[PDB]
Design a protein around this nucleic acid. Structure first.
Ligand code: MG
Length: 577
DNA sequence: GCGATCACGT
DNA sequence: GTACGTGATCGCA
């Protein structure tokens, strides 16, 4: 049982408690808090939020760093409270982040899923209480209060076992000194938001719509027929079958119309290049322009992303609504969408800094490959140097296609691509792709040793780790299915690289946030995507940031090779280049 | 409301 | 068969 309280009492405000501040809406920005539960040494309490959040003693307790709180996904509560003008401090244990560090593959999305990891089942899944989809609804207070109280009781009971296993894993500091402090920095970033120039966005959409009408009219002209170009089925009817173009690749059900396949079909009919153009502009328009305009808050003309800190299996952050990482880094209209992201105040500017080749630099360090480390200590062009070694040619002898092929081999390492995906990448056979890989290993024998050694370690221990002791379990590394084992092998190889890079960027964000406040700068972190950190700041702060930000980022950790940072600033995210 | 297909990132 | 994740569109029960 528990106290369904009508008012806040002093025994509810002890200096250690499990706390539940429930936000049912998936997007928690400016969203309702439907109820509150507190479990501490004196009992179990349910508080109605309209009551507790107006109580000065309760508000002071929430904001008191010395009053320690154990929670699940504290960033959600922290942000929903920020929109109410209330500060949450003193969160000493976050069970979502603890379960994520223990085993990111579990997919722990609620208290019940984390509780099940330690045989605790006296709590329901959130989906059982609130329902999913069209049926989703807050239940009546008796059902709601029991659920919130059981979640707090579970949290109270699970802190010690989770912390104990974290300590056995040497992940206790990872949680306490990296993920939890980062959680709060993300909260501030999400709350601050990023100003969007919606008039510029609507202009680009208008530009695209006119271009799409032009190309679409041309496609119907060449097809001799109207159809939904956006329907891969109707389009497969028209390309193959009608226009008799070869079928070079099949889909599980019908005709494949992938971009990779269409480019090879272009020499046969003028429609293909226009189909390719329609899909380019179509995805910019439909996914990015219209997608971004939907998530801009009209009150403040900002987008307020949500970072999922406990999702990837590498430790990389991910973000949604909007996912600004997914914005293209390529075309002279994809990356230009970044012109719509502007400073939120007059006479402020965007400052953007990004790690240069951090993954390959991490690989140099972990593998202690002599040639790769010397390349970075010389600050070489890594793709040019790789081409020199693979093709045994001098720097002036490297042609553009040689550099492209070396860069594709390096890209394969950074993202853990199979030789078939390298072959697919380079439009070459798997045999040729394999001999490319072998020549790489001849020039970087330390990388080869690392790749053999890490697979063997994964087989022996069951998992691999990153620089700051993140882990990834790889049960499929034993599989007799070739493709399943091969993927686990590539994840054994890739996760210490990508995940250690994630570690460094997170530590950099923490280090930078501390330095900015030490320095009493108004500059603020706004986004972290790819290997980049984006800030905004008064224009009067740019010269100081030009020294401060790269220094903090370069010194976040000390590797056997230097860390290199490129930095720019400008009037938009695009112009910070 | 799900698979399935595509295109973006990892 | 030969790469998972995000998110949009279009298909089908
Ligand atoms: Mg990246």
């Amino acid at each position: 049982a528990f106290t369904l309280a009508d008012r806040v009492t002093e025994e509810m405000l002890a200096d250690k408690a499990a706390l539940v501040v429930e936000v049912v809406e998936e997007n928690y920005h400016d969203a309702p808090i439907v109820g509150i539960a507190v479990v501490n040494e004196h009992g179990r309490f349910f508080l109605r939020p309209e009551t507790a959040l107006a109580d000065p003693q309760f508000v002071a307790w929430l904001g008191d760093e010395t009053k320690k709180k154990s929670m699940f996904d504290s960033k959600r509560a922290a942000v929903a409270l920020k929109w109410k003008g209330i500060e949450l401090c003193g969160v000493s244990f976050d069970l979502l982040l603890a379960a994520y560090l223990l085993d990111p593959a579990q997919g722990v999305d609620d208290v019940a899923a984390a509780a099940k990891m330690k045989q605790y089942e006296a709590v329901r899944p959130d989906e059982a209480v609130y329902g999913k989809g069209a049926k989703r609804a807050v239940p009546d207070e008796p059902v709601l209060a029991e659920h919130l109280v059981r979640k707090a009781a579970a949290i109270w009971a699970l802190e010690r076992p989770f912390l104990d296993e974290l300590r056995r894993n040497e992940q206790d500091r990872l949680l306490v000194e990296l993920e939890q402090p980062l959680s709060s920095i993300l909260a501030e970033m999400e709350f601050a938001g990023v100003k969007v120039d919606t008039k510029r966005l609507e202009q680009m959409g208008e530009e695209l719509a006119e271009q799409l009408r032009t190309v679409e009219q041309r496609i119907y002209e060449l097809a001799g027929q109207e159809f939904n170009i956006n329907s891969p089925k109707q389009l497969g009817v028209i390309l193959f079958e009608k226009l008799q173009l070869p079928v070079l690749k099949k889909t599980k059900t019908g005709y494949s119309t992938s971009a990779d396949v269409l480019e090879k079909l272009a020499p046969y009919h003028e429609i293909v290049e226009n189909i390719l153009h329609y899909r380019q502009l179509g995805k910019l328009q439909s996914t990015y322009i219209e997608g971004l305009l939907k998530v801009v808050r009209p009150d403040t003309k900002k987008v307020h992303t949500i970072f999922n800190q406990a999702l990837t299996q590498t430790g990389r952050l991910s973000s949604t609504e909007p996912n600004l990482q997914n914005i293209p880094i390529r075309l002279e209209e994809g990356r230009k969408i970044r012109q719509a992201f502007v400073p939120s105040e007059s006479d402020w500017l965007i400052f953007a800094a990004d790690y240069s080749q951090i993954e390959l630099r991490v690989l140099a360090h972990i593998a202690e490959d002599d040639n790769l480390m010397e390349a970075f200590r010389r600050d070489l062009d890594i793709h040019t140097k790789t081409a020199m070694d693979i093709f045994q040619v001098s720097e002036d002898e490297v042609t553009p296609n040689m550099r492209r092929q070396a860069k594709a081999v390096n890209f394969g390492i950074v993202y853990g691509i199979s030789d078939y995906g390298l072959a697919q990448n380079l439009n070459i056979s798997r045999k040729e792709a394999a001999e490319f890989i072998e020549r790489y290993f001849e020039s970087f024998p330390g990388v080869k040793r690392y790749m053999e050694n890490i697979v063997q370690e994964a087989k022996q221990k069951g998992y691999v780790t990153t620089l700051l002791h993140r882990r990834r379990y790889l049960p499929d590394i034993t599989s007799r299915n070739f493709n399943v084992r091969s993927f686990a092998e590539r994840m054994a190889m890739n996760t210490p690289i990508q995940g250690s890079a994630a570690d460094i960027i997170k530590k950099a964000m923490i280090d930078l946030n501390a330095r900015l406040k030490e320095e009493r700068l108004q500059a603020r972190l706004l986004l972290q995507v790819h290997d980049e950190l984006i800030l905004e700041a008064p224009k009067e702060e740019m010269e100081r940031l030009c020294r401060l930000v790269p220094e903090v980022m370069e010194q976040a950790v000390t590797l056997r090779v230097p860390l290199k940072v490129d930095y720019h600033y400008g009037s938009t995210w695009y112009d910070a280049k």
